[PDB]
Amino acid sequence: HMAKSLPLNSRSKTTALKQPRELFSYARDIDGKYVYDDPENSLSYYYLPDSTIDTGIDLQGGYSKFKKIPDEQNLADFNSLLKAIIKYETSEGKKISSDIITFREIMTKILSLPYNLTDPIDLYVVPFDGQLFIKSDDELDMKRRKEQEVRMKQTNTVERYDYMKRCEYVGYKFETIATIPKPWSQVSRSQIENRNKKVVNNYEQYLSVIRTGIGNVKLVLAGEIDCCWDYLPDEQNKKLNHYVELKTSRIIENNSQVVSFEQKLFKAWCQCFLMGVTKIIYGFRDNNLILKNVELFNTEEIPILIKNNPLTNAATEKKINCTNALKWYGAVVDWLNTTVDKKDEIKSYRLKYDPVRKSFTLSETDSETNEKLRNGQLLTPEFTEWRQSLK
RNA sequence: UUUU
Ligand SMILES: [Mn+2]
Ligand SMILES: [Mn+2]
Ligand SMILES: [Mn+2]
Numbered sequence: 001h002m003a004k005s006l007p008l009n010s011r012s013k014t015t016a017l018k019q020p021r022e023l024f025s026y027a028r029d030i031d032g033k034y035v036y037d038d039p040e041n042s043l044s045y046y047y048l049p050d051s052t053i054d055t056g057i058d059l060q061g062g063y064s065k066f067k068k069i070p071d072e073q074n075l076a077d078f079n080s081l082l083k084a085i086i087k088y089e090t091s092e093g094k095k096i097s098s099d100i101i102t103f104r105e106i107m108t109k110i111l112s113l114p115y116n117l118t119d120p121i122d123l124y125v126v127p128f129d130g131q132l133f134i135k136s137d138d139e140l141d142m143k144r145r146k147e148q149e150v151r152m153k154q155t156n157t158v159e160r161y162d163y164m165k166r167c168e169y170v171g172y173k174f175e176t177i178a179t180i181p182k183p184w185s186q187v188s189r190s191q192i193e194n195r196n197k198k199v200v201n202n203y204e205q206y207l208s209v210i211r212t213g214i215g216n217v218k219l220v221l222a223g224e225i226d227c228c229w230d231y232l233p234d235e236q237n238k239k240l241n242h243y244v245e246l247k248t249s250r251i252i253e254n255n256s257q258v259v260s261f262e263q264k265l266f267k268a269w270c271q272c273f274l275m276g277v278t279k280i281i282y283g284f285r286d287n288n289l290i291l292k293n294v295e296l297f298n299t300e301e302i303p304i305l306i307k308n309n310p311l312t313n314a315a316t317e318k319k320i321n322c323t324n325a326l327k328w329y330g331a332v333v334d335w336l337n338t339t340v341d342k343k344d345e346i347k348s349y350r351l352k353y354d355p356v357r358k359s360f361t362l363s364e365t366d367s368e369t370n371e372k373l374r375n376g377q378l379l380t381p382e383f384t385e386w387r388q389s390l391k
Numbered sequence: 392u393u394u395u
Pocket of ligand 1: 175204205226
């Protein structure tokens with residue numbers, strides 16, 4: 001049926017960037033249950049001395065005891081985010097002011113789209129109480145994840161497939177061996193030393209909810225935070241400044257590896273720029289998954305590093321440029337903000353990037369889909385009642 | 392989280 005499309009070459013004229021600020025946080029515990037009071041108790045702190053790095057940490061250590069959340073249980077959870085929002089807004093006596101409320105991974109997909117043209121995007125947009133609630137199409141995502149899985153099983157040897165699954169584990173192991181549950185001053189020597197034996201899980205999470213903007217649009221983004229650098233300030237407008245994102249990558253050996261590392265680093269920049277995270281730490285590991293060295297990047301410096309790398313030139317259309325991405329992102333969110341009637345709660349929309357047709361479109365959902373979205377699948381009855389109560 |  002009919003759909004409105006934004007041309008893929010659309011770009012905002014300038015870049016008016018607002019500084020992000022954390023509004024509140026919440027957490028997920030080791031059993032997968034969300035926590036809304038004293039969530040700061042779930043924030044870890046970065047701690048990884050060179051002397052420890054020198055020992056040659058095995059990042060596949062403990063792979064067989066990995067406590068891994070099933071993928072079906074690890075989708076972005078609007079229920080819990082809305083519950084966190086009701087708690088905050090009840091304290092403030094007022095709704096959060098924003099045009100869009102969503103998860104950061106969703107905007108990361110949009111922002112990085114210009115240099116990741118083969119990757120699909122399928123989202124749902126639900127207007128409610130003067131705001132746009134945006135979530136991913138869970139069913140399509142799971143279907144793509146399953147089909148990616150079966151590809152990778154079929155097309156790689158048993159050895160390569162096992163290695164790739166171990167590489168998935170490596171990311172979480174690095175987080176485990178590079179962080180401590182409290183700042184250096186409150187942690188004991190045992191805790192520090194025993195990290196390499198701790199059971200690794202990906203259940204526990206600390207989530208920041210931030211307000212930010214671009215152009216004249218306001219966005220609230222929920223995103224998971226890997227750790228805190230030194231201490232968490234009490235000053236609300238400074239909390240984001242102390243967060244850190246962790247990554248792992250293979251040590252780099254040829255120019256092929258250099259362009260791939262540029263691509264990953266851009267995606268890391270996308271994720272951290274949106275969230276106000278100022279530090280990205282890479283754990284570089286070898287073929288046997290031993291950690292070899294660690295490097296800190298300042299988020300704000302990444303655009304310069306990318307623009308000035310003598311090894312990674314390409315045609316202007318293919319060369320990653322952070323400013324160009326930001327102008328595409330700004331065009332998208334302004335389009336969403338002026339196209340959809342935020343006051344019409346009678347329907348919902350699919351927002352889709354289709355790489356085969358090269359199109360970026362908004363179309364109305366089916367009545368049954370709108371109903372599901374508004375009665376549990378995105379909006380919850382507790383949240384709708386809360387918002388109706390303020391008016 | 393993750394593949395040179
Ligand atoms: Mn984690
Ligand atoms: Mn993370
Ligand atoms: Mn990370």
